[PDB]
Amino acid sequence: MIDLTGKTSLITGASSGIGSAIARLLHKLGSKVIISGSNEEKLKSLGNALKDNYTIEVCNLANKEECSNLISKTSNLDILVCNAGDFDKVIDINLKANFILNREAIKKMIQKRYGRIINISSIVGGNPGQANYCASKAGLIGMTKSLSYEVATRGITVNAVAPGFIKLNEKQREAIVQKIPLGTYGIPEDVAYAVAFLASNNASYITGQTLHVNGGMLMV
Amino acid sequence: MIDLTGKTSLITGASSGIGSAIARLLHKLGSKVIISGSNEEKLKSLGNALKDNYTIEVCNLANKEECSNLISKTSNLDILVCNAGITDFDKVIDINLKANFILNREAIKKMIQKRYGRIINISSIVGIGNPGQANYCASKAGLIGMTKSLSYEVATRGITVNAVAPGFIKSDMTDKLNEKQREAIVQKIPLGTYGIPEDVAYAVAFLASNNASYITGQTLHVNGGMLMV
Amino acid sequence: MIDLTGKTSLITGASSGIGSAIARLLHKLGSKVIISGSNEEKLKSLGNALKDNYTIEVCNLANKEECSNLISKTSNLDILVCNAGITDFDKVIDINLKANFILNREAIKKMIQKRYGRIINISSIVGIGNPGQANYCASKAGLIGMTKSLSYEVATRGITVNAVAPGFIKSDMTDKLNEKQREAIVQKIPLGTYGIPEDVAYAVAFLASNNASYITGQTLHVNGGMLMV
Amino acid sequence: MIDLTGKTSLITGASSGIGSAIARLLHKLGSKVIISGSNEEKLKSLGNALKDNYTIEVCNLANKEECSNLISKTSNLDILVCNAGDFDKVIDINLKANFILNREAIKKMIQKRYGRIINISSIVGGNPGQANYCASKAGLIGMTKSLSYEVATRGITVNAVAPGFIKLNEKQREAIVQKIPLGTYGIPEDVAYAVAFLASNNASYITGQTLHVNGGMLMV
C-alpha cells in the first residue's frame, strides 16, 4: 500500500528514537532521506544503519537562519517531518523553528504542486503537561491547520502526529500508565507508522488533521 | 506494513462505492473479506471481481436479530468495518447508530477471546453540508462517541476501535448536481476537490493494520481539510 | 444581565436535582417556568416551593406523541431546557436523544415565528466515568451533534441552540458510594470536588439570557476541569 | 445572578473595544478594576467613564519584566483578564506575555485559594487565519487547559474566551459573514458578557474551558 519510492523526505531531530524510527521507516519504504539534527555523531550512526540514499544535515534548529537554510540546502523535497524539539525556550524550539521549516518547505513544495508536511508534537508530558509543552503542542496543531488551509489547492497536505507516551520509578510509571487505557507505553515505531501513512499518496485527501498515537489516552 | 494475510474482515454496506473500495483493498492486502449488504446481485458482481477469499452475506441492517446474527455467523473475525446506512430521525439513528452498536458489541464478544481485533466505524458522507441534517449529524457524532467508549473498554484486550469520517466523497460517474451546487460543495473543501472511495479505504486499511496497534478511539477525518480535528 | 422577566421557560426533568435547580433559578430570574416531568408529587412540591409563575406538566418523555404534545400545548415558549432521562442501548438512545429531538424540533416550530428562542440541551451526568457506557456516551455525543446541527439551521432566526455538559454532579444527601469509589471519582476531577446542581443551573441561565445572543451551538462543560473542550 | 462586588479585576489591553467593554461590565457588576495597557490617553478616557473604583496601569506587555511587574503592583487580585495582544511578534505578544501574566497572577491567587483567569484570543482572522494568530490562539488555549489543571485544587479557575468576528469593502464582509451562521458580526459586549460569567462565582465549577463567542462560526 504505502510506497515512498522516488521521494525525498527531510526529518528533523532525526537522532531521537522517534526521529530515527521515522527515518528508517521512510527509507525502508523507498524514500531518499535527509536526516537532520545537531548530533553529527548520532546522525552518522543512523546513516550507517541506513547504508545509502540518505544525507546528513548537521543543524541547530534553535538558530532561525539555520532552519531557513536547512530547507534551501535541499533540491528535491516531497516530505518534511518536523520532530520536536524557560517558557520561551520550548516555544522557540517546538513552535518558532517549526514555523520556519514549514514555511520554507511550502515555498519549495508550491513549485511542484506536491508535498507532505508532518509536524510531530513532543511526548507527554502529564495529562496536559507543563504549560510550555502544552502551549507549544497546541500552538503547533493550530499552526498545522492554518498552513493546511493555505496550501490545500496546491497539492500539499499539512498534518500533525501527536504521540502519547512513547518508551522513572515504579510510582511515576503507575501514574502514567493508569492514564493510558491500553495500559502500556507506545514505541517509536508506532509514531513512524502514522507518519509514513500521512507522508504517502494514500493520505492525499487528509490535511489539517492531528493523529494521536496514544493508546486511547486522548480520543480525538 | 499493512499485511492482512490470514485475517478475516467483515464489511457491511460492501456494495456502496466506499464499501466495495474497502472490500477490494482489504482483499488486495491479503484478507478474506466477508462482504455484506442487502442487494445480492450488486454483491455478487463485487464477489465476481474479488474472485477468491470472500463470502457474501445478504443481510438487512434494519433487522436487529439480523445484525446480531451477522457477526455470530462469521467464524474468525479479526476486522469489522461498519459502513453508514445513510445518504425519519428515528430511522437514520436506528441504522447509523443502533445497528452499528450491535455489530460492535457482537464483534467484541468474538474478539476479546482471541485478544485481538480491529473495529472501524465509518460515518456517513457529507451531504450537499458539513453540520448536516440533525439526524445524520446526531448519528455521526453518536457513532464517534460510541467509538470512544468501546475503545476505552477493550483497550487492554488487544482490540482497537476507531472511526473514519469522510467528507464529500464522489462515488458515481455523475453526482446528480448542477454546476452551482457543485461549486457550492467544492467551496466547502480546502483541497478544492472531492474524495473518492479509495481515499476512505486507504484510511480503513491503515487502521486495520497490525501496526495501528497503539491507535485507538480516534476519528480519522478524510475530508480534504473541510473539517480539521 | 440575566433578566428573564416576561419570559417562559420549559424544563423537562424538573424534579431531578439539576432540573429543579434550573427551575428555581430561571424562576428567580423572572421567568415563568413550565415545570415538566413524570412524578407529579415531586413536581407539586417543587411547584409549592416555587409558589407562583409556574405550570406543572405531568408527562412521559418515552411517549413520542407526548413529547410533541408537550411543546405544542405551551403557548409562549422562549426557552427550552431538555434535561437528560439518564443515570438497553436503544432505551437511553431513545430518551436522551430521540425524545430530545422532538422537543427541539417542536420548540423551533414555535420560536421561528417569534424570531427569538433559546434551546439548551443538557447531557447526562457522568457515572461512577468520563467516556462511560457506550449508550450514554453515544447519546451524549449524539445530543451535542444534534445541538450543532439545529444551531446552524436556526442561527439566522434569533434562536440559539446550545448544550451544557455536566460532569459528576452530586444531587443527593448521600451518593450511595463508599470511600474508595468516592476517591476514585474525585481523582477524575481536577477541582477535587463534585458539581452541585446549581453549578449546571448557573450555566443554563447564562445561555438562556438575552445577552447570550451571539453564542450558539456550543457545549458549556461544567465539570471541574475533568474534561477540557 | 452575577455579582462581582468586593472583587478586584485586572484587564490587560483595556483600551481595545473588547478590553473596554469588559472593563465597564466588570466595573458595573461591582468589581474594582485595574485597567492596563500602553495608551495612557485612552485608558484615562476609559477611566473617566468609569468615574471611581479603578486604577490605570500604563504598561507595555511586549516587555517581559513589565508583565512580571504589572501583577506585583497589585495587592488584591481576584480576576485577571488577558486580552490579545513576524511570527515571533504575535507569539511573543499573544502567548509569551500571557504566560507571564497568568503565572504571576497564579502566585498571587494561590495565597488566597481563590481566583479567576480568563485568556482572550484575538478576533478572527480567516477560518483558521494567518499561521501566527492561529498558532498563538491555539497555544493560548493549550496554555489555559494546562494551567487550569495545575491550580484546580487551589480554588483558581483558568478559562479562555474565543471571540469570532467582533465589530473592509462589501466583498471582504460578504466573505466573512458567510462563515458566520448568525450572519452578523458580534459586538464587544458579547465577549464582555462571557467574561463576566466566567469571572464570577456562578462559574466556580468551570475550568479549562474555552468559550467561543462567534455566532456559530465554530461549534465547540
Numbering used by the authors:
A (entry chain A), D (entry chain A): 1 to 85, 99 to 138, 141 to 182, 189 to 241
B (entry chain B), C (entry chain B): 1 to 87, 99 to 139, 141 to 241
Reproduce text from the manuscript describing this model.
One well conserved pathway that it shares with other bacterial pathogens is for fatty-acid biosynthesis as a primary source of cell-membrane lipids. In R. prowazekii fatty-acid biosynthesis occurs via the type II fatty-acid synthase pathway, which is thought to be descendant from an algal plastid and consists of four to eight individual enzymes that start with acetyl coenzyme A and malonyl-(acyl-carrier-protein) to create elongated fatty acids for the lipid bilayer. Thus, unlike other members of the short-chain dehydrogenase/reductase superfamily, FabG undergoes a substantial conformational change upon cofactor binding that organizes the active-site triad (Ser143, Tyr156 and Arg160) and alters the affinity of the other substrate-binding sites in the tetrameric enzyme. While a number of antimicrobial options have been identified for targeting most of the enzymes in the FAS II pathway, FabG is still relatively unaddressed, in part owing to the conformational change that it undergoes.
The SSGCID has solved a 2.25 Å resolution structure of R. prowazekii FabG, a 3-ketoacyl-(acyl-carrier-protein) reductase, which corresponds well to the solved structures for other notable bacterial pathogens while differing from mammalian analogs. For Rickettsia in particular this is a significant target for drug development as the organism has a minimal proteome with very few essential biosynthetic pathways maintained. The structure of R. prowazekii FabG is very similar to those reported for E. coli FabG and other bacterial FabGs; the protomer assumes a Rossmann-fold structure with a seven β-­stranded twisted parallel β-sheet flanked by four α-helices on either side and two βαβαβ motifs at the core. R. prowazekii FabG crystallizes with two protomers per asymmetric unit. A tetramer is generated by crystallographic symmetry. For FabGs tetramers are typically observed. It is therefore assumed that R. prowazekii FabG is in a tetrameric state. Based on these high overall correspondences in sequence and secondary and tertiary structure, conclusions drawn from the other bacterial structures may also be applicable to the Rickettsia protein. Owing to a significant conformational change during substrate binding, it has been difficult to identify suitable inhibitors for this essential and highly conserved enzyme.
